[PDB]
Structure 1
Amino acid sequence: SKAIQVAKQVFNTLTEYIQGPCTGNQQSLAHSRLWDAVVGFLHVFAHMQMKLSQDSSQIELLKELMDLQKDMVVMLLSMLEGNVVNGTIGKQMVDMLVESSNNVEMILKFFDMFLKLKDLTSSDTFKEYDPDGKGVISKRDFHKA
């Protein structure tokens, strides 16, 4: 937990060098080894989000991993805010998505799991499946539903 907070707080002070769109300060950062640092950070997130979503002892930890995951993309959102269309900084950001192809799809397929959780719970074909409604359904009837 203490190793994430320093990576989060160093990510915040990377945004503030960029945000008010000082264009030279995002030229000289796009030519650095920033992209190598954020390529490896996704590789942590795609693997870690599965295995810490197995017990409630890690779900205290996973919120801090989720919080850094939000705090990473706010930075590279702030690199894009001076583009035109086929802009240079727009091109390289696809490059660290293609040179990091295989690992960005684990989190997208991870977010699809819990986004469908609301309406299946909000579907009356499921709402009266085992119970009427109390805080309890089943495992085997929850399986087939």
Structure 2
Amino acid sequence: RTQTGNNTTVNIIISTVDYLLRVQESISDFYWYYSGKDVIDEQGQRNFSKAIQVAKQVFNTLTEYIQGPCTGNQQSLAHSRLWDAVVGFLHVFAHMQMKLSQDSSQIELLKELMDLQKDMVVMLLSMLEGNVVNGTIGKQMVDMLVESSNNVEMILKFFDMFLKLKDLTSSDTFKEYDPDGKGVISKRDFHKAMESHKHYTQSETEFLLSCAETDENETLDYEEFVKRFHEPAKDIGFNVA
């Protein structure tokens, strides 16, 4: 952050934040390119993968900068343009999660994106590390959250929807539609099971039907379904909470 002895000082921390802002702007532009299109082609998925990996490395560099209550670095990020990048990333996360989850060819991209979100939340937690009551860092974070309110609401509804899924699956009323331990259930059985569950509304139910990949046998593996969705939600939502 500050080279005390040297004649001239360069803020490597601020430069890292600036690069994070540029890369998140590029990622947002590429997502806006792919927003209207129904499916993302192989080249688009590869470019997203490379960009997400770069952003993940930058987030790790920032969290290693700020961990070990480095108060100077924490204040530097608080006063930097980090919040705008976090806001853009929150919009990207809130929309791309809904877009990719329905498609069954973007599982790898969804995993990469959900890991990037976890690293971002870890960076925010390291920001709050060593907090004080009524601190400027907390003020700026709640300002950022209020600015990105709608995207946070979308992410939090997504997480709650995929967190109730494990309770639904472990419910006995589901294991009577699946009496034997085959682990495979039909589309109609899944739909009427979630209707008997009554904790999922019609919109949540139809979204979960759409996010479910079925074969010509009309039956899917709910074990792999919950393994795919509950675990990322469980690990990211705990850090969010």
TM-score higher than 0.5 here? yes
Shift of 1:33: 0.7
Shift of 1:55: 2.6
Task: Give the stretch that moved more between structures: 17-26 or 64-73.
Answer: 17-26
Task: Give the stretch that moved more between structures: 98-107 or 123-132.
Answer: 123-132
**Are the structure 2 counterparts of residues 74 and 130 from structure 1 closer, same or farther at C-alpha, using a change threshold of 3 Å?**
closer
Aligned to 1:107: 155
1:56-99 Cα offsets, whole Å, 9 max, x none, are: 31011111001101000111111111221111111111000001
1:84 counterpart SS class? coil
Aligned to 1:49: 97
Larger RCO (CA within 8 A; separation ≥ 6): 1
1:43 counterpart SS class? helix
Aligned to 1:59: 107
**Are the structure 2 counterparts of residues 31 and 143 from structure 1 closer, same or farther at C-alpha, using a change threshold of 3 Å?**
same
Q: Runs ≥4 in structure 1, deviation > 6 angstroms?
A: none
Q: Is contact 1:97–1:104 with CA below 8 Å preserved after alignment?
A: yes
* Distance in 2 between residues matched to 1:29 and 1:16, nearest whole Å: 13
1:8-57 Cα offsets, whole Å, 9 max, x none, are: 00110011111111211111221111101111000000000011112331
* Distance in 1 between residues matched to 2:52 and 2:178, nearest whole Å: 42
* Distance in 2 between residues matched to 1:113 and 1:28, nearest whole Å: 37
Shift of 1:136: 2.2
Aligned to 2:164: 116
**Are the structure 2 counterparts of residues 95 and 133 from structure 1 closer, same or farther at C-alpha, using a change threshold of 3 Å?**
same
Mark the runs of 5 or more structure 1 residues left unpaired by the alignment.
Answer: none
Q: Is contact 1:80–1:90 with CA below 8 Å preserved after alignment?
A: yes
Q: Is contact 1:131–1:137 with CA below 8 Å preserved after alignment?
A: no
TM-score scaled to structure 2, two decimals?
0.58
Shift of 1:133: 3.5
Percent sequence identity over aligned pairs? 100
Task: Give the stretch that moved more between structures: 99-108 or 112-121.
Answer: 112-121
* Distance in 1 between residues matched to 2:129 and 2:72, nearest whole Å: 13
1:96 and 2:151 correspond = no
Task: Give the stretch that moved more between structures: 134-143 or 27-36.
Answer: 134-143
Aligned length, in residue pairs: 145
Q: Is contact 1:46–1:103 with CA below 8 Å preserved after alignment?
A: yes
TM-score scaled to structure 1, two decimals?
0.93
1:29 and 2:82 correspond = no
Shift of 1:143: 1.2
* Distance in 1 between residues matched to 2:106 and 2:150, nearest whole Å: 25
Task: Give the stretch that moved more between structures: 20-29 or 130-139.
Answer: 130-139
* Distance in 2 between residues matched to 1:76 and 1:52, nearest whole Å: 25
Shift of 1:130: 5.4
- Which is richer in helix? 2
Aligned to 2:20: none
* Distance in 1 between residues matched to 2:179 and 2:161, nearest whole Å: 23
Shift of 1:131: 4.4
* Distance in 1 between residues matched to 2:179 and 2:151, nearest whole Å: 39
